[PDB]
Design a binder for these strands. Structure first.
Lengths: 85, 162, 379, 80, 165, 82, 79, 68, 86, 74
RNA sequence: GGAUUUUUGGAGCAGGGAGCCACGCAUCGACCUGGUAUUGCAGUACCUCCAGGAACGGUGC
């Protein structure tokens, strides 16, 4: 199982937790959560730090959330990048 | 043989040939329509054929009742608050009953959804202008005595009685 | 149709009903007495019988046996009075025929069913004597109106409302008994010493639900009294008095705006102000419901006390005691309203061996000799 | 599940069923499966527009049921 | 138990036709079901099924040529038994077209039975006339019509009419 | 690993939860179970496009949760130990 | 009795061109030749097409693996 | 891993209500534990589509057009 | 640990919120793994959950009776009132 | 081909340029790095095509399995 | 213990404008006037054709 977290597509999350790097999460709510992965699981539940939530309403909006838990079903996409840099 | 909840509770209940929920009240010699509360408004129509009812009256509020088959009874009068207890009454079959005067058919004007009406084999049928009278006083009817109410009859009934 | 005959039949049926509920009031005077007593405290004018009569359960000379049944018959009489009111309403609203009466001469039928089917349609008591209920109200069931904890008007179940209340106060410092202590507040206390702030949402909602309950319970437990009369009485008291009905020699006149007023003058010129308009326009239903809770709880003081007592009792019970008591309440609830060695010997002989006859109730027989005897039997 | 046992108890009784799409089916429950699959007969169906129809025989998948109304004859499983 | 109707105004929509048919025919007994299609083959026709057989015979005699939606309907006994009847229920000549028996007197007569038998296009043989006026021999071109007449007066309060089985 | 276990440790914390249907819930956790079914007390709940309502108790089916906003103070590194 | 999975196995063997009804999307359907499939009804389609029922327009796809999540219905087409 | 109780409906004509407000009619030829169906002589409500597979997932309701 | 969080509210009157946004109020008598619920003397509300709305508290109320709700379509529950004694 | 199944097809397509359509109509073109048992998907040098038009150049991306409609090699 | 009947989502998003009244686009269905064809023994997606009418109904954006 660890092997599948380590080398499979979830290695994106595994890599973000290890390097304390930022990732953008496109989300079902049409919102995007930008931050660092403290923890994750099979379902893509996550505990996130320094989250910048961004969305649109046209008007763009954002808000800072230091500490939060995301239920993984809401995940559409998870992006790793030269974002943290 | 009074109409009863006990009577209603043992009565044949089924889905009829035109796909509606029907209660079979036929041939009990019922004289007065009463205690319909016990059907719990669960029927599309009620078959009251071959009984001894004198007046089409006594109904509780029944929102689902759409068809009333009242063949071979002794109906001589129609109650006045029928739309208040039967709002969606769409079909009324009164064949072979005792309605004698055109004015006795007046209470049917208040049944806003009434579309199929049958009054054959009633003395009232032979009264002069019986068809035109029904058409003008109960314009919501589309089929009268199994014949289409046509425009020309409506106009003709608009002249007479205007 | 000759109206004379119809109006006749009407007056006759009315007579029949009066006679029925009169026969009832006769067998068990309590039916009226009970009712009347309550009526006494709602419409003060009402004249009530001699106490002796009430106690001895007698109407003239004969003392009748003391009787769920009282309430039952009261609801039956209720529907009877409904019928009567209807008939009274519709009622308020020769050779030619004798010739047509000759129609269908040849019928071999006995006709003894006009006054007998009615008289019968409204009388006491099954085949002979099993159910007091008349054919008129044969499907009348009190248990569909009263819960088991209410015991047909003996108590009112307020535990549920104690729950909701805990949910309202957002704590648990409140016990069933302290909750009842709260209810007691309900002419001035419930207004000037409120459990919670009377502008609190949760509170007003609760009060609504509770009020509704108390009222329905009230009329439920006293079918015989004219509900509409009581309703209108209360409403008129609300409109005509509840006009600065609360007066203090010190603070003046209180308004259900929750403020006092120096004199009646400033009080009147405050009833047109934008503030009072706003409030009376938003909190009207609640104020009225509060008031109803008040007056209905007053009319039920005896039941309130009776229940509080019950609570304290059950509370001071043990386990076995509480259990047996519950058993009693249950029985009262679901009761008719009217009471009427050779071990090798059996193997050797072939018995105590499992066998079955299908035609008889899929019955079991323990022996082959016995089953062979089944072939000649009554059943 | 406890509710499932109570559902099976309603087999042979008249019940009402609303689907996930809000069509309302009333009639006799013939068979109820563990997953809430429901076979019924002599139905009255009331659509979202209000109109009624009549059906002899139906079978609805458990997942696509929002809820069921059962008789009150059952109410009297109080152990749980 | 089933009557076959033809010569019906085929412009009426199918569900309306069936509902008026049900209404009209309810006066004689419970109608179990109605089969009517608008195909080229079946348009203008309908099969009306009754629980009771006496009801079918009464319907046939009383509504022969009844104006329905503008046209005079033609009614006849169906050729076969309806599937619904066969399922609800569960010799080689039967159904036969010659019904001979007696138990129908009372000033009854040959022009009487001849007009009652006449009602039917099958009107072929009619023997009711001696001092008897109580022995009826009816030869009806075909059993649909013999069955129609027989089903029409199938309980002449009880007469005895016995097909030539 | 199984992060529901982490949430199960948050009894007596106050949190804000955003629901899948947009509703916002602020209250004190009395219990999270294995299905993430969450129970709270002293709850101010604001359905999307209403003013808040206060409830002494509220019980959420786990699947209907979008996300939890946790106390800034929360010592995550402690809670992530098993 | 024909089992649904077997029907598919038949579609596979036949190389009949297949048209798929998708879940909660009526305006588009998918077409192709089933080359293989798995326990989840995930399909490998060849020379596949998006079919726009509204626009009468076809989008050319080639080698497609469609998740079974989307499958409402499976039909065969002569083309 | 139960079967749906559908043997009663085998080789009968049926009316199938599917999600998306979609409706088809045809003869039941078989099924599996997921309630996936084989329907023969199927018609989209009308155009004839032949023998088809309906995934049980997207089956809202079925109604028999026959007597079982 | 305790499993009680549902069992506590059993027998109580409960306000249940559905996924379409309906309000079901009934006596909470049973539940299960999926949160399929058994609700006695259950009514449905659509427009409001009253907190003493001065105009009226009740619009589009429907009496349902004995209700089994599937857990799929349940969102949440709060305590509405105490158990009826009966 | 002689039966070509989902799983092998996807495995053959690892190391390759792919495009994934999601149920929601977004499209993502990139090199398929890997897939897992649940058919979650990892792209590199991802690009986003919405309305079939290049929207955003995104880099390395995880796509949750339930979102996927279909995958195409390209 | 995230792969069709429940708890790791098929959801997400789109309505005001004009003077109490009225409304864009696409698909399907009865449907309503005239006239016209068929006289056929069935168990049914629908059911003649020709011309005119839709201030009709449902679904999606």
């Amino acid at each position: 199982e660890e092997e599948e977290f380590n080398t499979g597509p979830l290695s994106v999350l595994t890599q973000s937790v290890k390097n304390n790097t930022q990732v953008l999460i496109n989300c079902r709510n049409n919102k995007k959560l930008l931050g660092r992965v403290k923890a994750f699981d099979r379902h893509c539940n996550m505990v996130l730090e320094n989250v910048k939530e961004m969305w649109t309403e046209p008007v763009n909006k954002d808000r800072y959330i230091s500490k939060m838990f995301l239920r993984g079903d809401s995940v559409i996409v998870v992006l790793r990048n030269p974002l943290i840099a | 043989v009074k109409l009863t909840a006990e009577l209603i509770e043992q009565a044949a209940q089924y889905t009829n040939a035109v796909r509606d929920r029907e209660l079979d009240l036929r041939g009990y010699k019922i004289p007065v329509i009463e205690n319909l509360g016990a059907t719990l408004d669960q029927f599309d129509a009620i078959d009251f054929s071959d009984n001894e009812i004198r007046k089409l009256d006594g109904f509780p509020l029944l929102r689902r009742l759409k068809t009333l088959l009242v063949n071979n009874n002794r109906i001589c009068r129609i109650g006045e608050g029928l739309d208040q207890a039967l709002p969606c009454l769409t079909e009324l079959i009164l064949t072979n009953n005792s309605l004698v005067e055109l004015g006795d058919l007046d209470p049917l004007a208040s049944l806003k959804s009434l579309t199929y009406l049958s009054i054959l084999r009633n003395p009232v049928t032979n009264k002069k202008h019986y068809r035109l009278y029904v058409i003008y006083k109960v314009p919501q009817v589309r089929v009268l005595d199994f014949q289409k109410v046509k425009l020309k009859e409506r106009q003709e009934a608009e002249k007479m009685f205007k | 149709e000759t109206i004379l005959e119809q109006q006749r039949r009407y007056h006759e049926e009315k007579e029949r009903l009066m006679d029925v509920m009169a026969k009832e009031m006769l067998t068990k005077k309590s039916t009226l007495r009970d009712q009347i007593n309550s009526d006494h405290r709602t419409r003060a004018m009402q004249d009530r019988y001699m106490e002796v009569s009430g106690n001895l359960r007698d109407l003239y000379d004969d003392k009748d046996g003391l009787r769920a049944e009282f309430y039952n018959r009261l609801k039956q009489i209720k529907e009877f009075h409904r019928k009567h009111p209807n008939e009274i309403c519709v009622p308020m609203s020769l050779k030619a025929r004798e010739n047509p009466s000759e129609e269908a001469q040849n019928l071999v039928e006995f006709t003894d069913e006009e006054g007998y089917g009615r008289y019968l349609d409204l009388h006491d008591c099954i085949n002979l004597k099993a159910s007091e209920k008349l054919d008129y109200i044969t499907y009348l069931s009190i248990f569909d109106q009263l819960f088991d904890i209410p015991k047909e008007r003996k108590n009112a179940e307020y535990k549920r409302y104690l729950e909701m209340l805990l949910e309202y106060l957002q704590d648990y410092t409140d016990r069933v008994k302290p909750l009842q202590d709260q209810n007691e507040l309900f002419f001035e206390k419930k207004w000037e010493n409120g459990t919670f702030p009377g502008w609190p949402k949760e509170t007003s909602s609760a009060l609504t639900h509770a009020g509704a309950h108390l009222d329905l319970s009230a009329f439920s437990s006293w079918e015989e009294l004219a509900s509409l009369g009581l309703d209108r009485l209360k409403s008129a008291l609300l409109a005509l008095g509840l006009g600065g009905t609360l007066e203090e020699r010190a603070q003046r006149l209180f308004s259900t705006k929750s403020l006092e007023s120096l004199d009646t003058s400033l009080f009147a010129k405050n009833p047109k102000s934008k503030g009072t308009k706003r409030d009376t326009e938003r909190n009207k239903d609640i104020a009225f419901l509060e008031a109803q809770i008040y007056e209905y709880v007053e009319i039920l003081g005896e039941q309130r006390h009776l229940t509080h007592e019950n609570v304290q009792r059950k509370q001071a019970r043990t386990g076995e005691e509480r259990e047996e008591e519950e058993e009693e309440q249950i029985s009262e609830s679901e009761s008719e309203d009217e009471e009427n060695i050779p071990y090798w010997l059996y193997k050797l002989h072939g018995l105590n061996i499992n066998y079955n006859c299908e035609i008889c109730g899929n019955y079991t027989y323990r022996g082959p000799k016995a089953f062979q005897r089944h072939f000649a039997e009554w059943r | 599940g406890v509710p499932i046992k109570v559902l099976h108890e309603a087999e042979g009784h008249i019940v009402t069923c609303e689907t996930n799409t809000g069509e309302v089916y009333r009639g006799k429950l013939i068979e109820a499966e563990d997953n809430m699959n429901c076979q019924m007969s002599n139905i009255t169906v009331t659509y979202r527009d209000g109109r009624v129809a009549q059906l002899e025989q139906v079978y609805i998948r458990g997942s696509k049921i929002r809820f069921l109304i059962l008789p009150d004859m059952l109410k009297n499983m109080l152990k749980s | 138990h089933t009557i076959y109707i033809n010569n019906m105004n085929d412009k009426i929509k199918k569900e309306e036709l069936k509902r008026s048919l049900y209404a009209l025919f309810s006066q004689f007994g419970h109608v179990v079901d109605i089969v009517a299609l608008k195909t080229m083959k079946m348009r203008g026709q309908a099969f009306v099924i009754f629980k009771e057989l006496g009801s079918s015979t009464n319907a046939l005699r009383q509504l022969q040529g009844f104006p329905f939606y503008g046209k005079p309907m033609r009614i006849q006994y169906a050729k076969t038994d309806s599937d619904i009847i066969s399922k609800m229920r569960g010799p080689d000549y039967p159904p036969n077209y010659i019904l001979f028996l007696n138990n129908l007197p009372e000033e009854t007569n040959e022009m009487m039975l001849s007009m009652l038998f006449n009602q039917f296009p099958g009107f072929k043989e009619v023997r009711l006339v001696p001092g008897r006026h109580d022995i009826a021999f009816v030869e009806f071109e075909n059993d649909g019509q013999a069955g129609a007449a027989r089903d029409a007066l199938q309980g002449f309060k009880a007469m005895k009419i016995t097909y030539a089985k | 690993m199984k992060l529901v276990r982490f949430l199960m440790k948050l009894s007596h914390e106050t949190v804000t939860i955003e629901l899948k249907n947009g509703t916002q819930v602020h209250g004190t956790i009395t219990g999270v179970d294995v299905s993430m079914n969450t129970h709270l007390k002293a709850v101010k709940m604001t359905l999307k496009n209403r003013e808040p309502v206060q409830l002494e108790t509220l019980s959420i089916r786990g699947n209907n949760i979008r996300y939890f906003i946790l106390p800034d103070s929360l010592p995550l590194d402690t809670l992530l130990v098993d | 009795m024909v089992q649904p999975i077997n029907l598919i196995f038949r579609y596979l063997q036949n190389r009949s061109r297949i048209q798929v009804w998708l879940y909660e999307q009526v305006n588009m359907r998918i077409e192709g030749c089933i080359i293989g499939f798995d326990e989840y009804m995930n399909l490998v389609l060849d020379d596949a097409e998006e079919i726009h029922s509204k626009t009468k327009s076809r989008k050319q796809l080639g080698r497609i693996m469609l998740k079974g999540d989307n499958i409402t219905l499976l039909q065969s087409v002569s083309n | 891993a139960h079967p749906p109780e559908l043997k009663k409906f085998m080789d009968k004509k049926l009316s199938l209500k599917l999600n998306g407000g979609r409706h088809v009619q045809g003869i039941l030829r078989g099924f599996d534990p997921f309630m996936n169906l084989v329907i023969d002589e199927c018609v989209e409500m009308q155009n004839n589509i032949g023998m088809v597979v309906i995934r049980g997932n997207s089956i809202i309701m079925l109604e028999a057009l026959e007597r079982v | 640990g305790k499993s009680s969080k549902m069992l506590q509210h059993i027998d109580y009157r409960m306000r249940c919120i559905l996924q379409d946004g309906r309000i079901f109020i009934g006596t909470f008598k049973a539940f299960d793994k999926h949160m399929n619920l058994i609700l006695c003397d259950c009514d449905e509300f659509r427009k409001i959950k009253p907190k003493n709305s001065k105009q009226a508290e009740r619009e589009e109320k429907r009496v349902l009776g004995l209700v089994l709700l599937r857990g799929e379509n349940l969102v949440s529950m709060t305590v509405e009132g105490p158990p009826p004694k009966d | 081909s002689l039966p070509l199944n989902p799983k092998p097809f996807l495995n053959g397509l690892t190391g390759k340029p792919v495009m994934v359509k999601l149920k929601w109509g977004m499209e993502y073109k990139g090199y398929l790095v890997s897939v897992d048992g649940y058919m979650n998907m990892q792209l590199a040098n991802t690009e986003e095509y919405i309305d079939g038009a290049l929207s955003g150049h995104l880099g390395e991306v995880l796509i949750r399995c339930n979102n996927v409609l279909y995958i195409r090699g390209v």
